Amino acid sequence: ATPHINAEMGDFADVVLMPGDPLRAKYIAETFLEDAREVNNVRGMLGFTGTYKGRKISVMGHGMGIPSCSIYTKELITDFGVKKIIRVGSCGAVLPHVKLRDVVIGMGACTDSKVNRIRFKDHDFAAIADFDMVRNAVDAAKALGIDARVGNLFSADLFYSPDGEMFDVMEKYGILGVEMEAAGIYGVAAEFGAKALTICTVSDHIRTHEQTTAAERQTTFNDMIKIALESVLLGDK
Amino acid sequence: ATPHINAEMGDFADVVLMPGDPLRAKYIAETFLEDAREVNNVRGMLGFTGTYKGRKISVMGHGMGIPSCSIYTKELITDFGVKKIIRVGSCGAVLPHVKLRDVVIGMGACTDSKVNRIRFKDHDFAAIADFDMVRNAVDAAKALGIDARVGNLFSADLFYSPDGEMFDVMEKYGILGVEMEAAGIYGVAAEFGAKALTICTVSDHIRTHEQTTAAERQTTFNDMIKIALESVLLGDK
Amino acid sequence: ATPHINAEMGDFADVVLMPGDPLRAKYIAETFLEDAREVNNVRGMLGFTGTYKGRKISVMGHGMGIPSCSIYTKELITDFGVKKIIRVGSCGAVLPHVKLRDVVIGMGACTDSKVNRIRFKDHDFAAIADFDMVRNAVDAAKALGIDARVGNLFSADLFYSPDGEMFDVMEKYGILGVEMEAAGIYGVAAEFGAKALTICTVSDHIRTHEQTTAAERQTTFNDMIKIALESVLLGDK
Amino acid sequence: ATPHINAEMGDFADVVLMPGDPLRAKYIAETFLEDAREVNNVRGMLGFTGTYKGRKISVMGHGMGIPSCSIYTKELITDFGVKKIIRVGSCGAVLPHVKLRDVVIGMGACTDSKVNRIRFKDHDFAAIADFDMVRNAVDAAKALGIDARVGNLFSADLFYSPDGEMFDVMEKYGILGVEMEAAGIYGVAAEFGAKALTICTVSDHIRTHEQTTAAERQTTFNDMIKIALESVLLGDK
Amino acid sequence: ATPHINAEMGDFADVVLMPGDPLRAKYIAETFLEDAREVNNVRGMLGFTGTYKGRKISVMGHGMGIPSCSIYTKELITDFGVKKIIRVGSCGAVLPHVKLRDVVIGMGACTDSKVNRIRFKDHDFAAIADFDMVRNAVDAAKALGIDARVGNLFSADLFYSPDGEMFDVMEKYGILGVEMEAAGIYGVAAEFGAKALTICTVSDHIRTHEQTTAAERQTTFNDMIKIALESVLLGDK
Amino acid sequence: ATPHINAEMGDFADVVLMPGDPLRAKYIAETFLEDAREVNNVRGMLGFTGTYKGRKISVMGHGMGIPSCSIYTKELITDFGVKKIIRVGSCGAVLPHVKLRDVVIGMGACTDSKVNRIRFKDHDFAAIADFDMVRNAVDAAKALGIDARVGNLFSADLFYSPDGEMFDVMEKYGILGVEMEAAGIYGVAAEFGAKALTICTVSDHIRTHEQTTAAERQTTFNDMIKIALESVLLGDK
Ligand SMILES: c1cn2c(n1)ncc1nc[nH]c12
Ligand SMILES: c1cn2c(n1)ncc1nc[nH]c12
Ligand SMILES: c1cn2c(n1)ncc1nc[nH]c12
Ligand SMILES: c1cn2c(n1)ncc1nc[nH]c12
Ligand SMILES: c1cn2c(n1)ncc1nc[nH]c12
Ligand SMILES: c1cn2c(n1)ncc1nc[nH]c12
């Protein structure tokens, strides 16, 4: 066991899909995995392991924010042999042409967190996904006939930001979605020697204020899960 | 409702105790509150409302880290009429004289997060509790026979720090306990015009190891909750 | 002797009251202390030691600004055995409900100085007073029929700030008074293991031009000194 | 003409390969392009336009450093209709398994420059290449049977760095090559609305001090040029 | 009058000499000026105006540290028509070839204060003296048989620095003397359109403990004042 | 040789004039030096050595921007025995009273680069010229009948700034000219123990437009070169 995960080596597959919401992890386990068993419930952060088309796969919540997901991804990498993390999250759009339920793939993640400056001597660490994992997700989306944009996310510390003008800067620089985790997960992957990718579904539009419900976020973002799971199968080959 | 809390105005008391662990919110409600009902379950972040000695009180998890607790505390304040937040958590000690099971009250909270610099034009915002709430907690602890330490917490973004050297710095400057939330809660309270307090029990020494029993640790945890609840009654007058 | 204080261990009491204006030290000694003796004259920063209701007390100015008061408070703590520093001074108000001549007690002090970032590995140190000293001052004021406000000061490096918009930020975040020392004194106290408190009276509103009389100012200054002295006696228990 | 390029709209192709060294641009034009004409020599920064397998292509030096290449890439994008910039550069290796003459593809670029903080409100902008261009370069390398690693570059302002320990941090975080431009080019591409990729040949090993000569850098890094040119042809399809 | 100077326009000369120690103002007036009159006494910061070889000169202390001297220099420039400020003070040396009692002229002043970053959009403002004033002081010293050194001072906020290693950095970069004001005075002069110069004598070596006699110190202080006064006459041409 | 200069010790004089444009180095050598030979052509960065009035002098381009000129100046100092660098360049004016064709001498250079913060523990290094070199240039200009302005330059990383507002800040603080090198050259000179000076002629007003002729601009350019060369002869004694 680790301080936040009551499990043992082998309980997790070498690939873990991670939404922020543990109830979405449970939905993924029930809907997409066969023979799923629950492997963690410390702090209610449900994690499960099962098979997808014969391939061992885990799915576990990571909580909201860089500090929360950095705990879980670290422990999985250092004590559970996890080689790849695929975050399957929600995000808010700033660009006019990005719509609710669009799927975005974060090849990079900007951030207003200090965590990577702490790692990188106060310089600019480009928080990037693993290239092969990005390519796997693009190819899986194409085979599924699901559109997906590839580019930069913005990992915010404040969902309720006091700096509304920064959204204009994100829009200027082409940010595809605002979420709260990717840059921290990518920093962990680099620090602890694993590979990661963030895929998000647009759940809110920051300008129009249109927003999905909590239930919709929990059980209706299926395109993104299919892409993630099929991308693993491509990577295995 | 908000995207993270499926509740309506009135479902929460005007004071909310918040542990990090939602299962601990359930523990608190079942142990200390009468006539308690669940008022939120979005993302598994259980919240409850009941009475303590006739006084309406809520308890709800806040998740790990400044970004997670900043969402919940903001929404409680702006959308549910909440006037006081009391975080009730665990912390790690760096000072030799601070012992396992000491009760620490964070009159201030240091941090390595950027969130308050974002709020405060890149200057130093002293993230502080409400003075009257601190005094109520000190007085409640005295009435219970507990000698609480009052001082600075350190709210960390990285539970797994790359910078081991920062613990020596915290020790030098008298930090009583390391946790992951107080400075963010205090920033939200100041931003949105509410009042907050963090109380923690020392659950470990970051460097060394002392010996306690589960029974003794759980007794002290309950003492912290009793301090928080009794402090509300003192504030009510 | 130290570089800025020509005195020896024992010449200062363990508690030192410190106005900014050096001319106030002699006034305090003559007006409030019995049997006062001169203990420093270096650079004209006159220091005196006497008794208040039998309790040994010293008084010496600290000069304007964080760098000045950091010199004197350090030397007093490390070379003269001083355990408590009470700054007694003036501040400017930004909040419309804070009135001329109000007593403000800085439980915390925000700042635009770099000194605490230099100390604290470029993170946010919450520059805080000693809690017991805060409560002692609150209680001493109440016994004198004065309701002091407790909260954050802002310790500015530039009395003449080029950033006028910062005052609106200070107001939004509840800053009770703008002065030039508290955050630096609090950082010294933490660095060298002592206790400190800043008490100020509101001399002006930053934005308006309302006036006081000379008799009002003397009455209010005397009230502040009485609060500070009586607060020490409460701290002795 | 623009302030640093004496040419007119149409003189450049919509894709420009750019080494830092204008003499390498001349070598590329003479060796790989047919019917190449010189289109700029302001400040000696030679640029040429010709055809590669029938496809109009330009090649022009960008000088050393983020400030230099930001001038040329901006002017090309805003006044010459340039849609894609492919930097074809040299870099120094920090990782033990990276050897002289290895080809590296910068999907991201870390930096110690302030230019992206100036663009991005002092937050972390993840300076990333265009994904399709990265994929085109990977595929072209595979078809040519040339090995290429994809990952992060580090764009340094100081070739002669006073902070040798930062090379340990780069190595820790998996930096494939240290150069002086990519993060600035990627920032320009995002600011001015174009697409960019940096490909480098390892010209030095920072730990072993093995180094290619000036002549070798100028006329013997051919794998990288073939990859860049063939990648354009893939992108056209 | 201004908040810290009880005087009217015309009471100060257009040139003000400013020691740090307020007691030096009267000494300078009595020793070097003819017909001196008292023009300020607020907070004990005595100011005087007289003539030197017929030329109107004022003298008033500035207090220790950037925040203190920034107040007085601003008020003198904006409300008293002061055109030139000459700080005359002491500094500590880090270079082994810089000797006790050497005269150092700060053509520039490095700093660890934030005041110039606040002024200059968080970029690097080179805090510089007026060139003619520098050369006037060099020439006045040479006419008195003194070879002054011209270069960078370092203006520290913390006389008691927690970062001992910074002195080695100062030495590597050629800093001639450590004091606490020049960079702040130079920033005020630039902000408000006036001219300034800091001259210091080396009172100590930061690392060693070598001593001077009281007669040596007075002789050297008088030499500095003579340099400053004669330099003004050279500036008048 | 170095990777950027194909020359040997002795090929350069101990003083090197450096324009940004290598074609301008050729212009200077051909116009002002006798018996001049080319000593470098790596990357097209032409350098030459000849005599001016019998005195051995070199001239070599430095490229655009702090990173480019930092390479060349470091290598000249550490590997070619160079003791003095004189940058001879163009700058843009922000002050209304600074006119086209004024000669500006940078006694200091502000910057938005991070290079000096990297050198100087993230504090403010005042990037300054060598005083004696400044004086030599002022005196040479006077002997030629030119009234050079001495003050601060601003060395920009982005010729195309996103922050138009910074030009108003430069104007407020008295910046005489905007270029892209001086602060970096001055940092190299301090780091490696050499001496440097930047002279520029005003080639444009960043905001407005005045009218000159090519003949007049070229005359003033030549005056700058004459000032630089004659200043060396004065320094030689
Ligand atoms: C879904 C939305 N969303 C988010 N997840 N994270 C941060 C954020 N800021 C605005 N909107 C946001
Ligand atoms: C309880 C919490 N806690 C801890 N014990 N130890 C270290 C630590 N860092 C952040 N939070 C921490
Ligand atoms: C008393 C103090 N004070 C003030 N009144 N107003 C503005 C201000 N800034 C620093 N200190 C200040
Ligand atoms: C080739 C090498 N190289 C470079 N290009 N740029 C920066 C740098 N730092 C070390 N070695 C470097
Ligand atoms: C005279 C001044 N001085 C000194 N001697 N030594 C160290 C120091 N730090 C700031 N100012 C200082
Ligand atoms: C000559 C140079 N120069 C200029 N004229 N104008 C603006 C500018 N920014 C950097 N360098 C500049």
Author numbering:
A (entry chain A), B (entry chain C), C (entry chain B), D (entry chain A), E (entry chain B), F (entry chain C): 1 to 237
Please, what does the article write about this entry?
In the WT PNP-N2,3-ε2APu and D204N-PNP-N2,3-ε2APu structures, the ligand is bound in all subunits, as the electron density in the appropriate region of the active site is in this case unambiguous. In both structures, there is one subunit in the closed (chain A) and two subunits in the open (chains B and C) active site conformations; thus, an active hexamer is composed of two asymmetric open–closed dimers (A-C, A’-C’) and one symmetric open–open dimer (B-B’). In all active sites, a phosphate ion (or a sulfate ion from the crystallization liquid) is bound in a typical position, at a hydrogen bond distance from Arg43* (from the neighboring subunit) and Arg87, while in the active sites with the closed conformation, also from Arg24. As there is no pentose in the N2,3-ε2APu molecule, in the case of the WT enzyme, this part of the active site is occupied by glycerol, which was used as a cryoprotectant. The orientation of N2,3-ε2APu in the active site cannot be determined unambiguously as, at this resolution, the electron density blob is symmetric. In the case of the WT PNP, the orientation differs in the closed and open active site conformations, whereas in the structure of the D204N enzyme, the orientation is identical in all active sites. In the closed active site conformation of the WT complex, N2,3-ε2APu can be modeled in an orientation where a hydrogen bond between Asp204 and N9 of the ligand is possible but, in this orientation, ribosylation would occur at N7. In the second possible orientation, C11 of the ligand is at a hydrogen bond distance from Asp204; thus, the hydrogen bond cannot be created, but ribosylation would occur on N2, which, indeed, predominantly occurs as described in Section 2.1.1. For the WT PNP-N2,3-ε2APu complex, in the active sites with the open conformation, the ligand is “flipped”. In one of them, a hydrogen bond can be created between Asp204 and N7 of the ligand; thus, ribosylation would occur on N9, while in the second one, N2 would be at a hydrogen-bonding distance but then ribosylation would occur on C11, which is impossible.
